[PDB]
Amino acid sequence: KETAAAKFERQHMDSSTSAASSSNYCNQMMKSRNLTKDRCKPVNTFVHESLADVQAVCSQKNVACKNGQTNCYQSYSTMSITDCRETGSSKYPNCAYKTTQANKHIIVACEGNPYVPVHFDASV
Ligand SMILES: Nc1ncnc2c1ncn2[C@@H]1O[C@H](COP(=O)(O)OP(=O)(O)O[C@H]2C[C@H](n3ccc(=O)[nH]c3=O)O[C@@H]2COP(=O)(O)O)[C@@H](OP(=O)(O)O)[C@H]1O
Numbered sequence: 716k717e718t719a720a721a722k723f724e725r726q727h728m729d730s731s732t733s734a735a736s737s738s739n740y741c742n743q744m745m746k747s748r749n750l751t752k753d754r755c756k757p758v759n760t761f762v763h764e765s766l767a768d769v770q771a772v773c774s775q776k777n778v779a780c781k782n783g784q785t786n787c788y789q790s791y792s793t794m795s796i797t798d799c800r801e802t803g804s805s806k807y808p809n810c811a812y813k814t815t816q817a818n819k820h821i822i823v824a825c826e827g828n829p830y831v832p833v834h835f836d837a838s839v
Pocket of ligand 1: 718719723726758759760761780781782784785786787824825826833834835836837838
């Protein structure tokens with residue numbers, strides 16, 4: 716029974732690499748973090764910042780979530796992120812992803828005690 720917070724770190728945290736590495740970064744990471752285990756997840760963002768820095772976003776700019784809830788927060792500063800999007804020539808179980816390194820503000824949804832990120836909403 717993985718916690719939502721643990722799931723968040725699994726699906727979005729990559730503090731090892733400070734920037735999107737190889738052109739094959741997404742193909743490798745999406746596979747390794749078990750994101751293509753029963754479906755190719757269409758889009759996934761990895762954050763290359765410390766866990767503490769990302770957790771801090773939960774006490775930063777409160778903004779509306781794409782779903783209407785209000786437990787979302789935007790980082791005051793931009794962070795190093797890598798967007799992984801599925802390519803059309805991608806078919807389960809041979810999932811294929813386009814890698815995209817960027818520096819943007821991230822928006823996460825937080826929950827619990829402690830108040831930690833559990834969902835990645837968007838980057839701006
Ligand atoms: N306000 C909220 N909005 C959305 N979810 C919320 C909210 N508050 C709490 N949650 C809860 O957080 C857990 C993880 O959310 P989930 O969408 O499953 O994962 P993700 O990694 O964010 O995966 C998401 C984000 C990722 N994604 C999307 C866009 C992008 O730029 N990058 C990226 O990684 O793609 C997926 C689809 O994008 P979308 O739902 O925004 O359309 C869930 O709980 P459980 O799975 O434990 O039941 C959920 O109920």
